[PDB]
Amino acid sequence: SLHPSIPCPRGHGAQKAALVLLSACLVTLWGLGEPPEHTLRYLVLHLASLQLGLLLNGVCSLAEELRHIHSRYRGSYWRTVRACLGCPLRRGALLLLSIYFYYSLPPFTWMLALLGLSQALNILLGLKGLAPAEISAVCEKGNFNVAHGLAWSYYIGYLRLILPELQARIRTYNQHYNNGAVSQRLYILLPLDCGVPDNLSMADPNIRFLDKLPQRVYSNSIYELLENGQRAGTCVLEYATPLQTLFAMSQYSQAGFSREDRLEQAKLFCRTLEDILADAPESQNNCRLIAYQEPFSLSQEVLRHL
Amino acid sequence: SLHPSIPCPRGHGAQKAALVLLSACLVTLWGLGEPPEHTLRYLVLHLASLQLGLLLNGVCSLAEELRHIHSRYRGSYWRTVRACLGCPLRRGALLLLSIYFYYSLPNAVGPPFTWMLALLGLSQALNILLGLKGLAPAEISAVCEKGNFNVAHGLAWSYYIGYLRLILPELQARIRTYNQHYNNGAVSQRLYILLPLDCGVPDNLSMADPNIRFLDKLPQRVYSNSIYELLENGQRAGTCVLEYATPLQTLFAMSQYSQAGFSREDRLEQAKLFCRTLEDILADAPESQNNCRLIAYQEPFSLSQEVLRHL
Amino acid sequence: SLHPSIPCPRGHGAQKAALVLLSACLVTLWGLGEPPEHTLRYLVLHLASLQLGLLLNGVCSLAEELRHIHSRYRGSYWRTVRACLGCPLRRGALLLLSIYFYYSLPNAVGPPFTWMLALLGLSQALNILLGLKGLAPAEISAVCEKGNFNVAHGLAWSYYIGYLRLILPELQARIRTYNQHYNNGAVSQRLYILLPLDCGVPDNLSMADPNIRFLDKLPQRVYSNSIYELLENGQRAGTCVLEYATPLQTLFAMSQYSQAGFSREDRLEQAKLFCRTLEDILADAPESQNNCRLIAYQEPFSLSQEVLRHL
Amino acid sequence: SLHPSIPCPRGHGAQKAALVLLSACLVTLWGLGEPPEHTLRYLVLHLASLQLGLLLNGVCSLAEELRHIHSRYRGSYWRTVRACLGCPLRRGALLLLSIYFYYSLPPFTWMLALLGLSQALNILLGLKGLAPAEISAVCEKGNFNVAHGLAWSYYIGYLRLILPELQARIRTYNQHYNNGAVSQRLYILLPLDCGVPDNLSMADPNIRFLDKLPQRVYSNSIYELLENGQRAGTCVLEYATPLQTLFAMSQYSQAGFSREDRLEQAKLFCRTLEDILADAPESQNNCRLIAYQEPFSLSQEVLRHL
Amino acid sequence: IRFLDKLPQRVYSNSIYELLENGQRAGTCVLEYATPLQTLFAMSQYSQAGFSREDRLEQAKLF
């Protein structure tokens, strides 16, 4: 609802389509007309190599982690083992389960040399790479995103400090003058393009700076929303200052934060600001978000919510 | 370098294990003396299952992304496949290799290719639903650090682009102006940014330790800064412009709220990571040309002892 | 899109067509009917032949590099090895597989390892001596433009960082001031930078075409800007702040000298590329907030028309 | 002559040691003791595959240039073929020479298809990549290096315009102020780490600003060189600005310019500026370059040149 | 009257002024106050000069 080009939280399409594929997959195994004794042996041995390979992958990971004991895991060996190999208990059972069934199921020592060699090629040539559309899912589900830190810093830092003392300063400026009364809500502008001009008239000339709201120290502007050369309304406009910071990351070569990522993350920052302003006690319909990506009259969009 | 506890950027110990492992792999293959020809096919066939799996897994992962395409992938089909399947042309060739390496190759162990198609699909769904192929927390922190997906990365950079970048150019002159109009000791020209690893950031700096006491407000948008003196044994041991790290404070309040999904285990990592990233940004930035020095520690001891040794 | 002559950055057509040839080549492998056991073995063996040769060639490449360690590689040997042999931990992971797949695998065609190693160095030595395995310019041009190995990339970024990033913020203010204090048409608020692709840069802009002539130097680290009137049919259709691009002059003078090793055709290659690099830089820079305009033309026509059509 | 850290112009350590490596490897062929016709045909077939290897790489690259033909090659198919395949006839003649040797020397059509397929995997996967050592071994030879541009333009634009009239301005300044004449040479500092403060005082307090030389407008500042609290030299100091641009080039992400390249090109920029000023009419011992790198006394570095 | 620029250059610096009229530029000439009149005013300001206001006015006219 915030904007047609803001991504919704990831749903369960992967779960549902897999279920449909799983339903259709189990159908076609029955069509072969073959006993499932081989199928069960194949499936168990198919999983056995993965668990065996996962151990060596953890072991290969651990050799980097062995010198990391004093750095990340409080100088503890057991915690380091858990990080690479997952839960030691559940993983440990799978290791012994595979070995016992592998010997029973009809070489013995040749596969480990080959499987250990195969795990090397995944580590060395990077065949088992992470698809970014699965990097995004895990990063978003675990809240490993840069935007999730830019929004929470904004809310805890700026919004949660002026929102209580905003409607009061709006009311006082309304009585102290006579003007069309200014709206009692802050209309945060969230330019999705992350190009934030230092003056509002630069984005559109029909929006003009009129006055500064009386006042830790904060300064806000009231803008003369002009339609057909006449005032149609007034409000307090304010760009999201993180949207500059996300932009100025993309310029710098040290950020490792490219243009495709800049737009991709800045989409989250607005989404994870609505999810914050929805439940925040300081938000009592006293702050209204407006987003717009230039394909546009900025003045009408402010009027659109008015 | 900043502290014995701050993690170092990952080395190449991963492939170091693999190369040593491969050294123990070729010898083991040579020691057992297996038929070399079938050893070649088996490794390829094994990699034929692995790379054909990344398509069945990808397509299931692709199903959801076809509904974000208008917003997340700017309404383009080719920016949907490249996110779920890596580079398409590079990945597309490997599939034709794996298909060719499985369509008609002799295979003592393994089903025919048309049989293996069904067995692969059933295997992928089981791993997806149960999460058997779960990401290890060691690799989660490894990939995110490499691709810069950690939340402390932004909080370190935003603390630079917003505040640190805008005040270091004038901080030397502002400190110089105060010293020339004050006592004949003197205040150091280097800013100090406290980075308590515990993220315990008292509102008043003097309350952390009695030896550090607020002296004066440094003269000048209001960029207020309070200069502090370090009272060691009742005498003016040293004075410097000291402040806490606001992003660490915002991290501390981040973990408290339950709408952030920020456990205290994660906050400790980002408390450490935010220091190293701030070390990296200030290492080469033109503004931080020996203009700022960072203080990081973990409270188990006096804070004044650590700041004094830096002067 | 500035001019039809300027080239676009290299695409992925080479990878795209290679997929088609891979697809058609798969048909012939399935049509002739040779056993896949030998086809898989040869293909691994053939790929083994190419990879194993790169070792000695890299060794001969490293041979000159042993004395460059003190100068071009900061005194570390392992940085030198990666420079010549590619990734040390990956290429060695491919040589070892080819060593195992040639010391053990059957070799229906080709010498044994004890024999191939003799011939392997011989072919590379001849290629090094005679330069037979040479890089055609399209391979060099691709590496030059992908890895930013050009002199135009140098000039464009220098031109922006040194000149265009320092007057564009202050260009709008002076144009507004000049328009405000004088009431005789109006001057556009944009600098219409002229980019003559032929690198013909006269000192006097009015001499280029009669319709352009000097009006008044624009009042203001002492930047001299001359605005011009565009006499169309003897009528001042419009006036603008107009100037040439100095680097495109310094590309011309580079080709004149015989010490630069910068041929006439190379000048054209690094002149078209330079203009594209400037647009890619201005279109993303914050300073060019609709503040600068590019006018690129290759002389086959009046200069005033294109300047006018952009107004 | 300039600095130990400056890379020397590429000698011939390859041919010096490759031939020696060949000489040791030329003895071993006589050691094996094998028939010569068998050896002869293998080598010919080896070069026959490479000719097709070069043919397929160029032809695949030719498919891309059908979009750049009207831009890079002036709409002429001849330059399109020449850039990709090298010489249209010399390369073409080798192929049929190789093919005729291919069939003459002891399947045929299936071998050609396999060779084409194996070249496709070379292109898509990119195993046969260009090593960084040979990337900087061709660009240096072909003068396709970024710092070469920032060097010559710094000459045609700045050095060639101020050097002829510098000594006159120094002579005028030396006459006007008596007692401690300045050196008649322009000292262009070249800090190889590219750390260029706006003023020399921040780099080292032992160097003092003295005055600005009389004068478009050219401003050169004369700097005092102090030693143990007393003057030791006076000369015109001016950082090579392209080093500052090179340092700021690596800062921005759109430059595609790494940190090592900054260090690598800064080393190159002095050496190509050495070559220009070695054989230039505007160099009459009136301009001596200073290059240094902290692994220090910058102030004492200048005195060694005096 | 608007300041325009400084005349090109012991060194002597002089100023050229815009002579605005009805909002348009109508003339350009070098305007430079007679500093001795400023000196006379400062003389009348201080009490050690023994130099009254009418004295300053009359000396301005004679100057």
Ligand SMILES: CCn1nc(C)cc1C(=O)Nc1nc2cc(C(N)=O)cc(OC)c2n1C/C=C/Cn1c(NC(=O)c2cc(C)nn2CC)nc2cc(C(N)=O)cc(OCCCN3CCOCC3)c21
């Ligand atoms: C982006 C920098 N950054 N990233 C992280 C992570 C931490 C910091 C950081 O260090 N910021 C900070 N600390 C300061 C300390 C002093 C001082 N001691 O004098 C002075 C400063 O500059 C004025 C300080 N600044 C910068 C300005 C900051 C707060 N602020 C913001 N929000 C952000 O910038 C922002 C972006 C993101 C992402 N998250 N945030 C929230 C912090 N919008 C504002 C609009 C107005 C206006 N229209 O007038 C006035 C503001 O502040 C004046 C009042 C200062 N108050 C409040 C804070 O505490 C000190 C006293 C505004």
Ligand SMILES: CCn1nc(C)cc1C(=O)Nc1nc2cc(C(N)=O)cc(OC)c2n1C/C=C/Cn1c(NC(=O)c2cc(C)nn2CC)nc2cc(C(N)=O)cc(OCCCN3CCOCC3)c21
């Ligand atoms: C081509 C020479 N070159 N190649 C490389 C690589 C680096 C340099 C170089 O550094 N040259 C330089 N250094 C100077 C220092 C002084 C001084 N007083 O110290 C005086 C000079 O002469 C005026 C200086 N010059 C020459 C002219 C320089 C600057 N300038 C340019 N630049 C380019 O065209 C150009 C080409 C390439 C390639 N990259 N660039 C961007 C730098 N265009 C201009 C147009 C106008 C006008 N229309 O009026 C006015 C200019 O000068 C006013 C600005 C003076 N500022 C500049 C920097 O800060 C201090 C002084 C212009």
Ligand SMILES: CC1(C)C(=O)N(Cc2c(F)cccc2Cl)c2cc(C(=O)NCc3c(F)cc(F)cc3F)ccc21
């Ligand atoms: C490295 C080595 C020797 C190995 O250890 N395995 C594990 C394994 C089995 F998978 C199957 C049986 C025995 C073993 Cl022992 C393996 C498999 C193949 C292969 O082609 N598997 C096809 C395949 C399946 F059989 C089932 C499935 F669900 C998917 C699938 F894609 C090639 C080489 C190996």
Ligand SMILES: CC1(C)C(=O)N(Cc2c(F)cccc2Cl)c2cc(C(=O)NCc3c(F)cc(F)cc3F)ccc21
């Ligand atoms: C694709 C196919 C069938 C092909 O066309 N050739 C060309 C060719 C020769 F190069 C050599 C002989 C016959 C043919 Cl017929 C080839 C070669 C190999 C191979 O293993 N070459 C090893 C190898 C050498 F023989 C000489 C050398 F100096 C180094 C070296 F590394 C594998 C498959 C093929």
